[PDB]
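Workshop exercise sheet. Pairs work together: one partner reads the sequence aloud, the other fills in the structure field after running the prediction. Swap roles for the next sheet.
Pair: D.N. / O.F.
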Amino acid sequence: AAAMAQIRIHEVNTRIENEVKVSKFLQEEGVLYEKWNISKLPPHLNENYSLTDENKAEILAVFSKEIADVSARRGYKAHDVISLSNSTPNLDELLINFQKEHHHTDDEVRFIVSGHGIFAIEGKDGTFFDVELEPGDLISVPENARHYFTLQDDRQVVAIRIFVTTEGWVPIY
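Structure field:
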């Protein structure tokens, strides 16, 4: 009963928390889930949303190999880092775009560096489920999966946006 990356299935309000049951579940639905060594992260970068460019390029350096592997697996090109939190003067106005149910023509892959997030993703059967993400969680939302995204009750995330193509973060509503 230690939980990482829990699922809340929507219409039947059910939670899968045991971590083998979750990774298997996400496997059935076409979604990659990996856990990386978030403990390979320095303390200064632990929960730092006032991120500078020397910071972002180090977060990237720490996880270069994991990125490499995931980029190789899905044949992706680039990566960056974004921090969302109160004290982003435009949080609401950004988030609103991706809370609207959408899909992309590429996988959307994200690794949670600090804070939390939730991807609500349309299952194969037809039912949505929430994928509640903590620091250390890597997630790929497959191309054409219908989803939306949301911050948790903490209202702050820092993620590594990894990219198949430039044109694939674009929401198709």
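Discussion prompt: The chain has one domain: 1-173. What would you look at next?
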